[PDB]
């Protein structure tokens, strides 16, 4: 059962399409936006 997970899919493509329309930004910003969220990772 335990082996691998959704390598950016479960919420990636799902939230990417919704985030675009929700935020009104282009996927081009999404790449950086998503990549930036994974880089820094929260604030704590």
According to the 3-state scheme, what is the secondary structure of the chain?
CCCCCCCCCCCHHHHHHHHHHHHCCCHHHHHHHHHHHHHHCCCC
Separation of alpha carbons 20 and 35, rounded Å? 15
Tokens of 6: 């959704």
* Contact status, residue 30 vs residue 20, Cβ threshold 8 Å: yes
């Amino acid at each position: 059962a335990k082996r691998e997970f959704n390598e950016n899919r479960y919420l990636t493509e799902r939230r990417r399409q919704q985030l675009s329309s929700e935020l009104g930004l282009n996927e081009a910003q999404i790449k950086i936006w998503f990549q930036n969220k994974r880089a820094k990772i929260k604030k704590s």
